[PDB]
Amino acid sequence: AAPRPPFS
Amino acid sequence: AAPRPPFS
Amino acid sequence: PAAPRPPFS
Amino acid sequence: AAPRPPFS
Amino acid sequence: SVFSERTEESSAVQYFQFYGYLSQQQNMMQDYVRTGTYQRAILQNHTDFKDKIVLDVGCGSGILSFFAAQAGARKIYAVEASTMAQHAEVLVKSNNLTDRIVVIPGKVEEVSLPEQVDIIISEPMGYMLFNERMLESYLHAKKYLKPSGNMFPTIGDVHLAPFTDEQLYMEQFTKANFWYQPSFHGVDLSALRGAAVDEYFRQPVVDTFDIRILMAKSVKYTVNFLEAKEGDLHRIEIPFKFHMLHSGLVHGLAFWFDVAFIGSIMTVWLSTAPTEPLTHWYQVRCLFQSPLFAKAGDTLSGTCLLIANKRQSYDISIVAQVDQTGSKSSNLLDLKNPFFRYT
Amino acid sequence: RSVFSERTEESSAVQYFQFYGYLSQQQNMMQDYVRTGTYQRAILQNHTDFKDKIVLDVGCGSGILSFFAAQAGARKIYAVEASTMAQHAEVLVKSNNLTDRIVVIPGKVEEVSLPEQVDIIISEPMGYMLFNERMLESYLHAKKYLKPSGNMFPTIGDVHLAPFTDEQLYMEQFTKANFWYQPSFHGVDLSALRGAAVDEYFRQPVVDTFDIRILMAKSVKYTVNFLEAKEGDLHRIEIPFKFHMLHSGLVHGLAFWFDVAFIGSIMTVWLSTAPTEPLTHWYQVRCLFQSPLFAKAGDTLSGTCLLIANKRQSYDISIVAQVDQTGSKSSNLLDLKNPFFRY
Amino acid sequence: RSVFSERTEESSAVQYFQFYGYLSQQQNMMQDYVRTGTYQRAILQNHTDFKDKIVLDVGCGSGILSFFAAQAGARKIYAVEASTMAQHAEVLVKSNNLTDRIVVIPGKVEEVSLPEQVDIIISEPMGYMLFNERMLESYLHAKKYLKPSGNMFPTIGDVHLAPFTDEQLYMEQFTKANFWYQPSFHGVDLSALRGAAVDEYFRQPVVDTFDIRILMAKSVKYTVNFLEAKEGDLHRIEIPFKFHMLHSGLVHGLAFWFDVAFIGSIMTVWLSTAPTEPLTHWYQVRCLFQSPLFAKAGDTLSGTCLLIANKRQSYDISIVAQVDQTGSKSSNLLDLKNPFFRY
Amino acid sequence: RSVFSERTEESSAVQYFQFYGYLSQQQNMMQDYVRTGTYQRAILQNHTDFKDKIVLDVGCGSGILSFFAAQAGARKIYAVEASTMAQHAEVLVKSNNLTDRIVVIPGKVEEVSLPEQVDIIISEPMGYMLFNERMLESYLHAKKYLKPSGNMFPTIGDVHLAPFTDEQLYMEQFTKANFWYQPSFHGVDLSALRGAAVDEYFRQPVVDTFDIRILMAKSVKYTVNFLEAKEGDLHRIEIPFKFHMLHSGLVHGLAFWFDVAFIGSIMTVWLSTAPTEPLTHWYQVRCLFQSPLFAKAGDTLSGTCLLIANKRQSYDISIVAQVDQTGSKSSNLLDLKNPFFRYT
Ligand SMILES: *C/C=C/[C@H]1O[C@@H](n2cnc3c(N)ncnc32)[C@H](O)[C@@H]1O
Ligand SMILES: *C/C=C/[C@H]1O[C@@H](n2cnc3c(N)ncnc32)[C@H](O)[C@@H]1O
Ligand SMILES: *C/C=C/[C@H]1O[C@@H](n2cnc3c(N)ncnc32)[C@H](O)[C@@H]1O
Ligand SMILES: *C/C=C/[C@H]1O[C@@H](n2cnc3c(N)ncnc32)[C@H](O)[C@@H]1O
């Protein structure tokens, strides 16, 4: 449960 | 966290 | 310390 | 010229 | 404190452990839309920061404080509750800005500031805007704001629109149908299929999508951070009546958000809309339990009710119906545990 | 008050058992056909060890292992599960008409009460790298319910470690950390935190698979005998190693995997997660050195892997390694609870 | 008290002219058919600029340019060379039966005594990146022997610079510096010299060719007019630039090449070392940033290239570049006399 | 002013020490595992020659050899280095917490002052063909700081000569020079310089490696004992040879390599650059004859290799050889300072 989603 | 890694 | 002009072929 | 030759 | 009264300790521990990692800071900082826009908003409105006192709520690595320093700020109080505060302290010293930026570790609801400030800067937006319940810490920080003070961002708009995504809907049952077999290694699993379906439908879907799945102009619910009180976010009722622009099966509602930095010189917008370049917030979709057929021109009316919980997130209740036919559907979702579907 | 709560922070246990309450996570483990099939193979082919016996299933999840014990002829099976999955397990017991033989006991194995001693304990306590989750201590703790000369499935566990070369993985992780090398990220000097960034990223065990050609020496084995070990033996695990290098080049770290053996009366069945075997949801685990060691074929690489159990249900690991011929040493720390799922 | 010796350390001049005393180095330059053929083209196609004229050949080497001037009908050619190659040039003049037209005068052009003023000066004073060797100053110094109506071949020089992206080249150079990152090289900690090593490697200009698709913007041009310039104009060369980025990505450095034009009475002939043209022994030159700058298409990359002549017959180069939209700035130094021949 | 400046032209010295100021040149040497590993083994395996001893390190570069002497237990190490690498060595001594035991003394060993005599001298004074760089003389000069008991690491050096056949290497010289043998290079007749181009190539020693099967006779050895030799012994080095040919063929020149021995109290360790051993950054060296000499198996190839020190920190090489059975003679003059690096 990542508060801020992983991004690229 | 995630105890067991995702699979297939 | 180098050559002034590069090697070329 | 280089006292010690290039080496890999 | 206000924070501990509205938050389970177990939720808070995990929350701030997540933000103690430099890799998570890096994930946000590398978001060019996010980092660049905040920089533009602050620098292009330099008169709002020149010789001013600034409060940075949840500074993380402190990047926004440095932007406020680039804009000529006189003194910046940067509050951060995770262990990332110590890393921000290291960057303040190595950038020779100890005289201008003071890092205060702890929660903004619990630390003491020496003086009131002219403007508050922060990035309290979670996915679907409201997740993490940090907008309440951002509004709570107004107890340190001068009466004539400003907020950066100044307002936040959440947009709701109905969408059609047949494959997304059918994907839920394809996964749950794993349990619908009478002899999985000799065991009948079919009795848990319904529970698997319910489990998937409680999850908002975090990813992006082609704007062609949208079926109506979004409905906008605005939060004015200058006017709002943190009690306004405990229960967020969003009525909607969509004028359908396309005919098809509505499978749920899509969510995104914008914020505006209303400066003295100009207003800068940070958008996570699907029509804009992708950000680390992506977008969010909540499925109906059953789809609703709507003709173009029909109205799909209902309410989206977000009820804050002590896990720093919201329980989402969605009710919708097609007025012309009375066809009705709903769903109830847990925003704290979404499904990150992006690939 | 119990053995579990004294060695576990509440916040860790909350999220640990929440994770296992999701049916999707059961599906994830169950669909691992190597894992599920080998377990059924060990139990059914050793049916004499179960016929008319009393059984304990530690952490039964959906109860799948209990059904296998029932298929093999067990008289009664006590199936202990601490997560909310215990409710779904009971639902399966009833739908499969096995109420007369599988009794689900909700709770932690360190806290529940059993009506009788058991002849054999079954469980799947292996986390990635074997020791993650610290469930092996619960597995050993359950021996208090085991009759003298009672058996355990699995009976023993073998941890394997071998040095590897993988310049791509090293550069992949180093490139990430070098984000904090930037002296002017949007005008801000981040370099002060590069050291901390490198530390954080290289504390992350890399969980994925790899071709066996990257191994530079035959593996060393560390065996845990579950019949004999006490749970206190897992609080501080010291694994010495002395590798005889088979190829020359850079040693970027150590790779880890494990096998468990089900030593039954009919036959011994092995469940292996080695890179020479088909892939399982445990994958393999590699630990990266911040600086690789150069070694020639014939050199010996000696050192120690020290695993200190923490109260977040995992281990803090220190790996010290040196090339004996040259005195080139490497000291590293892994946070086994913060893995990088690279696959 | 020669102009040459005042601006040149003896140790630099000794090795400089020792290099040019080798016939193998003449062959290397002469076999550059683009270089040699273009020079002959410029001279023969502007033959009226040479017919019955007095010519000065500065740094004639083996004398090929003097023979071209004689082919075009020059009445008298004074061929000046400071290396021992002058004696080989005399041999060729005699074996080619041109003792009556080509007069080799050994020595430095700043120190020899010519019998008369000349109508045109011909030379090949270009080093890599044009300015290396500081031979342009000897070329300009020679204008003391030029008639007021005189011409210069080459007549002008254009330096081009453009930003590039080349992740492979960056990692290649950074991988070399990382040797000094080791904390236990044969048991010795080298890491304290990491910084010095990175500085040394990235001070080296990279001399090789590359595909034009790595360039991220149209080149900026800096022109030296040899007819008008004076020696002192080359002691401090300041080249400002402002690129309009055509592609998004990482700017790893600046690429350099040069053109010279022979502006004759009949036609202008160009000799180009651009990467869009056939390769020459000058190749192209690239200066690497220790940390690349990120820029989006449409951004502006502004800054300055400053070349300070040194007494070792080369320049100390400082490059400052800035992505205007974000304030991301990169400062670099390069020792033009310590190049990395990568080809 | 000093022994060094008396035998070295300023321009040669400036270039020489600038080269050694680059970390990349130190890295090039340090990454030679045969070189670095053998020095470490020679020192650590003779730890009793270093335990609680005073050490002088001549030309320490980055200081790697001083750190090995420290690993071996030396009490005090004086590390002398003339290039700007000395400042980097000082950083590593500080960062390795060895400032109590290692003292970096920037300057030429012929010009610095040491506070006391030492028990052992360590150095890597070997150039290609051993003698290039004329650093052996600085190594021998340093014996003024050595106690009567003193030892030296390396203790002795052997240079080996052997005749070789390599038709392709020989013919390659004329292929390159024949560039000049054309009557109209862009209208210019270059042929008058062909002879000069040939001479230029033949004056170059060839630095690279080769298959040992090109060697035509067992090598001859010339030994320098560093414990006994004096500086003046290296100004004129005469190496007589009389090879008993093992194979019939054309002899195109002489091949050179060298070994050094660290003769310690516990054991003798050898560092060899022979073509039978793993390659090092010294490679091997070959000097061609102007004209090849035919010799049958059993014939004797006799002559002299004379090395005359020059003020460019190298040697002028004169090689004279004849096949005794036939009287056919050949020679060559080579400039050791400007070799051709042919390895690819
Ligand atoms: C989305 C960004 C979150 C950042 O703000 C910090 N943060 C969250 N909540 C608080 C409170 N109540 N006080 C201080 N800082 C807070 C997160 O740690 C993250 O850096
Ligand atoms: C790797 C599988 C773990 C399964 O066992 C359950 N579990 C973990 N730890 C305990 C304790 N102490 N008591 C009972 N069950 C436990 C996990 O919930 C999962 O199903
Ligand atoms: C790039 C070509 C250089 C040639 O010109 C000769 N050279 C350099 N600098 C001088 C001066 N000052 N006077 C005469 N000749 C010079 C080089 O030797 C080379 O042949
Ligand atoms: C082959 C290695 C040479 C190293 O020794 C240094 N060096 C040469 N010659 C001297 C003298 N006379 N004094 C001190 N150091 C010397 C080279 O600079 C290199 O590091």
CA dist F31 → D5, E175, F26 (Å): 60, 12, 8
Q: Is H116 helix (H, G, I), strand (E, B) or coil?
A: coil
What dihedral angle (degrees, nearest 10) is formed by the CA atoms of H74, H75, H78, H84? 70
Centre of ligand 2 to C-alpha F82, Å, is: 6
Question: Residues of F with CB below 8 A from B3's CB?
Answer: 16, 19-20, 127, 132-133
* Ligand 3 binding pocket mutation candidate from G12, G57, G58, G122 (most atoms within 8 A of CB): G58
Those residues with Cβ within 8 angstroms of residue E75's Cβ, 6 or more apart along the chain or in another chain: E53, E54, E100, E101, E102
Contacts of H141-147 with C-beta under 8 Å, sequence gap 24+, read: H141/H3, H141/H109, H141/H110, H141/H231, H142/H56, H142/H58, H142/H80, H142/H109, H145/H56, H145/H114, H145/H117, H145/H118, H145/H121, H146/H56, H146/H117, H146/H118, H146/H120, H146/H121, H147/H117, H147/H118, H147/H119
Q: Is the CB of H82 under 6 A from ligand 4?
A: yes
Look-up of token digits 């071209």: G68
The burial of F224, by beta-carbon neighbours within 10 Å (0-12 exposed, 13-18 middle, 19 or more buried), is given as buried
Q: Which residue ranges of F make up the annotated binding site? A: 26, 35, 59, 81, 110, 138
F61, two tokens: 């999840």
How many residues are listed for chain E in this entry?
Answer: 343
Establish whether F124 is a catalytic residue.
yes
CA distance G61 to C4: 14
G151 and G48 in contact (C-beta within 8 Å)?
no
Residue G303 sits at φ, ψ, to 5 deg, of 165, -155
E214, two tokens: 């949208």
- Contact between chains at G186 and H37 (C-beta distance less than 8 A): yes
CA distance F227 to G208: 67
Q: Does residue H231 share a domain with residue H312?
A: yes
Instruction: State how far Cα H232 lies from the chain centre.
Output: 17
Instruction: State how far Cα F250 lies from the chain centre.
Output: 27
CA dist E228 → E125, E143, F263, F277 (Å): 15, 12, 67, 60
Q: Does residue E142 share a domain with residue E162?
A: no
DSSP H246-273: SS-EEEEEEEEEEEEEEE-SS-EEEEE-
F176 and F204 in contact (C-beta within 8 Å)?
no
SS (H, E, C) chain G: CCHHHHHCCHHHHHHHHHHCCCHHHHHHHHCCHHHHHHHHHHHHHCHHHCCCCEEEEECCCCCHHHHHHHHCCCCEEEEEECCCHHHHHHHHHHHCCCCCCEEEEECCCCCCCCCCCEEEEEECCCECCECHHHHHHHHHHHHHHEEEEEEEECCEEEEEEEEECCHHHHHHHHHHHHHHHCCCECCECCHHHHHHHHHHHHCCCEEECCCHHHECCCCEEEEEECCCCCHHHHCEEEEEEEEECCCCEEEEEEEEEEEEEEECCCCEEEEECCCCCCCCCCCEEEEEEEEEEEECCCCEEEEEEEEEEECCCEEEEEEEEEECCCCEEEEEEEECCCCEECC
Q: Is H200 helix (H, G, I), strand (E, B) or coil?
A: helix
Those residues with Cβ within 8 angstroms of residue H44's Cβ, 6 or more apart along the chain or in another chain: H68, H71, H72
Domain that holds residue G185: 156-343
The DSSP 8-state label assigned to residue F238 in this structure reads: E
Nearest to G287 by CA among G249, G259, G320, G246: G320
DSSP F151-195: EEES-EEEEEEEEE--HHHHHHHHHHHGGGG-S-BTTB--GGGHH
SS (H, E, C) chain E: CHHHHCCCHHHHHHHHHHHCCHHHHHHHHCCHHHHHHHHHHHHCCHHHCCCCEEEEECCCCCHHHHHHHHCCCCEEEEEECCCHHHHHHHHHHHCCCCCCEEEEECCCCCCCCCCCEEEEEECCCECCECHHHCHHHHHHHHHHEEEEEEEECCEEEEEEEEECCHHHHHHHHHHHHHHCCCCECCECCHHHHHHHHHHHHCCCEEECCCHHHECECCEEEEEECCCCCHHHHCEEEEEEEEEECCCEEEEEEEEEEEEEEECCCCEEEEECCCCCCCCCCCEEEEEEEEEEEECCCCEEEEEEEEEEECCCEEEEEEEEEECCCCCEEEEEEECCCCEECCC
CA dist E276 → E210, E283, H296 (Å): 11, 11, 85
F330 and F289 in contact (C-beta within 8 Å)?
yes
F9, two tokens: 């922070």
Cis ω before G154 (30° cut-off from 0): yes
- φ/ψ region of E304 (left if φ > 0, alpha if ψ in -120 to 50, else beta) reads beta
Establish whether H52 is a catalytic residue.
no
Q: Is F26 helix (H, G, I), strand (E, B) or coil?
A: helix
Those residues with Cβ within 8 angstroms of residue E173's Cβ, 6 or more apart along the chain or in another chain: E197
Nearest to F79 by CA among F57, F61, F108: F57
Q: Does residue G272 share a domain with residue G220?
A: yes
CA dist F202 → E247, F175, H299 (Å): 53, 12, 66
Q: CATH number for the domain including H148?
A: 3.40.50.150
Helix (H) or strand (E) holding H316, with range, is: strand H315-323
F122 and F67 in contact (C-beta within 8 Å)?
no
F129, two tokens: 């790298």
E40 and E67 in contact (C-beta within 8 Å)?
no
Rounded (to 5) percent helix, strand, coil in chain F: 30, 35, 35
H14, two tokens: 């400036």
Q: Does residue E341 share a domain with residue E205?
A: yes
**Number of folded domains in chain H?**
2
Those residues with Cβ within 8 angstroms of residue G100's Cβ, 6 or more apart along the chain or in another chain: none
- Contact between chains at F25 and B4 (C-beta distance less than 8 A): yes
Those residues with Cβ within 8 angstroms of residue F253's Cβ, 6 or more apart along the chain or in another chain: F163, F164, F166, F286, F287, F288, F289, F292, F319, F332
Q: Does residue H194 share a domain with residue H138?
A: no
- Contact between chains at H33 and F325 (C-beta distance less than 8 A): no
F288 and F169 in contact (C-beta within 8 Å)?
yes
CA dist G201 → F178, F275, G335, H22 (Å): 18, 39, 10, 9
CA distance E310 to E231: 14
G273 and G330 in contact (C-beta within 8 Å)?
no
Resolution in Å, one decimal place? 2.1
The burial of H137, by beta-carbon neighbours within 10 Å (0-12 exposed, 13-18 middle, 19 or more buried), is given as buried
* Angle at alpha carbon of residue G204, lines to G201 and G210, rounded to 5°: 110
* Angle at alpha carbon of residue F240, lines to F237 and F241, rounded to 5°: 140
Q: Is F294 helix (H, G, I), strand (E, B) or coil?
A: strand
The identity of residue H144, as a single letter, is K
C4 and G20 in contact (C-beta within 8 Å)?
yes
Contacts of F14-17 with C-beta under 8 Å, sequence gap 24+, read: F14/E10, F15/B1, F15/E10, F15/E14, F16/B1, F16/B3, F16/F133, F16/F313, F17/F82, F17/F83, F17/F84
Q: Does residue H138 share a domain with residue H178?
A: no
Best of H11, H85, H188 to substitute, by most chain G Cβ atoms within 10 angstroms, is H188
Best of E30, E31, E32, E67 to substitute, by most chain G Cβ atoms within 10 angstroms, is E32
Q: Does residue E48 share a domain with residue E126?
A: yes
The DSSP 8-state label assigned to residue H211 in this structure reads: -
Could you tell me which residues of chain F have a Cβ less than 8 Å from any Cβ in chain H? 294, 296, 325-327
Centre of ligand 4 to C-alpha H59, Å, is: 4
- E277 to chain G, minimum CA–CA distance in Å? 13
- Strand bridging mode E101-105 / E117-122: unpaired
- Contact between chains at A3 and E279 (C-beta distance less than 8 A): no
CA distance F203 to F314: 13
Neighbours of E76 (CB within 10 A): 27
CA dist C2 → G204, G313, G314 (Å): 11, 12, 11
Exposure class string for H155-188: b at 16+ Cβ within 10 A, else e: bbbbbbbbbbbbeebbeebeebbebbbeeebbeb
In chain C, positions 1-9, which contact chain H (CB-CB < 8 Å)? Answer: 1
Could you give the angle at which helices F10-19 and E9-19 cross, rounded to 10 degrees? Answer: 90
E119 and E88 in contact (C-beta within 8 Å)?
no
Nearest CA owner, ligand 4 atom 11: H108
Residue ranges around ligand 1 (CB below 6 Å):
E 3, 16, 19, 58, 60, 79-82, 84, 107-109, 123-124, 132, 134, 137
Instruction: State how far Cα G87 lies from the chain centre.
Output: 26
Nearest CA owner, ligand 2 atom 17: F59
Q: Which of F49, F57, F90, F124 is catalytic?
A: F124
Question: Residues of C with CB below 8 A from G128's CB?
Answer: 5-6
Q: Is the CB of G198 under 6 A from ligand 3?
A: no
Those residues with Cβ within 8 angstroms of residue F328's Cβ, 6 or more apart along the chain or in another chain: F293, F294, F322, G184, G185, G186, G187
Q: Is the CB of G4 under 6 A from ligand 3?
A: yes
CA atoms within 13 A on the CB side of G110: 16
Nearest to F159 by CA among F196, F131, F193: F131
* Angle at alpha carbon of residue G92, lines to G86 and G94, rounded to 5°: 105
Q: Does residue G146 share a domain with residue G120?
A: yes
CA distance G204 to G197: 11
The burial of H148, by beta-carbon neighbours within 10 Å (0-12 exposed, 13-18 middle, 19 or more buried), is given as exposed
Exposure class string for E256-295: b at 16+ Cβ within 10 A, else e: bbbbbbbbeeeebebbbbbeeebbbbbbbbbbbeebbebe
Looking at the DSSP bridge assignments, the partners of residue G335 are: G316
Chains C and F touch (3+ CB pairs under 8 A): no
Q: Does residue F314 share a domain with residue F167?
A: yes
CA dist F249 → E97, F167, F253, F293, F297 (Å): 45, 10, 12, 8, 8
Neighbours of F172 (CB within 10 A): 15
Exposure class string for F83-102: b at 16+ Cβ within 10 A, else e: bebbebbbbbbeebebeebb
G251 and G211 in contact (C-beta within 8 Å)?
no
CA distance E240 to E243: 10
What dihedral angle (degrees, nearest 10) is formed by the CA atoms of H128, H131, H133, H136? 130
- Between chain B and chain F, the number of residue pairs with CB atoms below 8 A apart is 39
Q: Which of E8, E31, E232, E334 is catalytic?
A: E31
- Strand bridging mode G76-81 / G102-106: parallel
G305 and G317 in contact (C-beta within 8 Å)?
yes
Q: Which of H154, H176, H207 is the last residue of a domain?
A: H154
Ligand closest in space to the Cα of D2: 4
Q: Does residue E177 share a domain with residue E104?
A: no
Neighbours of A1 (CB within 10 A): 17
The number of the ligand 4 atom at minimal distance from the alpha carbon of H138 is 12
Q: Is the CB of G82 under 6 A from ligand 3?
A: yes
Q: Is the CB of G83 under 6 A from ligand 3?
A: yes
Q: CATH number for the domain including G214?
A: 2.70.160.11
Cis ω before F148 (30° cut-off from 0): no
Q: Does residue F171 share a domain with residue F127?
A: no
Q: Is the CB of G138 under 6 A from ligand 3?
A: yes
Q: How far apart are the first and last CA of chain C?
A: 22
CA distance F307 to F289: 16
CA distance F56 to F143: 10
Q: Is G303 annotated as a binding residue?
A: no
* Angle at alpha carbon of residue H196, lines to H193 and H199, rounded to 5°: 155
F333, two tokens: 């720390």
Q: Does residue F313 share a domain with residue F177?
A: yes
Helix (H) or strand (E) holding H335, with range, is: strand H329-335
Contacts of E321-330 with C-beta under 8 Å, sequence gap 24+, read: E321/E292, E322/E292, E322/E293, E322/E294, E322/E298, E323/E298, E323/E299, E324/E295, E324/E298, E324/E299, E325/E293, E325/E298, E327/E292, E327/E293, E328/E292, E329/E288, E329/E289, E329/E290, E329/E291, E329/E292, E330/E288, E330/E289
Nearest to H161 by CA among H97, H237, H99: H237
Q: Which of H154, H179, H214 is the last residue of a domain?
A: H154
Could you give the angle at which helices H85-95 and H23-30 cross, rounded to 10 degrees? Answer: 70
The identity of residue E34, as a single letter, is R
- Contact between chains at A5 and E280 (C-beta distance less than 8 A): yes
CA distance G77 to E155: 81
Nearest to F84 by CA among F34, F29, F21: F21
Contacts of E139-144 with C-beta under 8 Å, sequence gap 24+, read: E139/E225, E139/E228, E139/E229, E139/E230, E139/E232, E139/E233, E140/E2, E140/E108, E140/E109, E140/E230, E141/E55, E141/E57, E141/E79, E141/E108, E144/E55, E144/E113, E144/E116, E144/E117, E144/E120
Ligand closest in space to the Cα of F23: 2
Look-up of token digits 């969408």: E163
Q: Is H127 helix (H, G, I), strand (E, B) or coil?
A: strand
CA distance E319 to E304: 7
G38 and G29 in contact (C-beta within 8 Å)?
no
Question: Residues of B with CB below 8 A from F126's CB?
Answer: none
Cα Rg of chain D (Å, integer): 6
CA distance F197 to H250: 64
The identity of residue G301, as a single letter, is L
Rounded (to 5) percent helix, strand, coil in chain C: 0, 0, 100
Cis ω before H183 (30° cut-off from 0): no
E233 and E221 in contact (C-beta within 8 Å)?
no
Q: Which of E153, E177, E206 is the last residue of a domain?
A: E153
Nearest to E225 by CA among E265, E262, E269: E262
Residue H263 sits at φ, ψ, to 5 deg, of -90, 95
Look-up of token digits 């590897």: F164
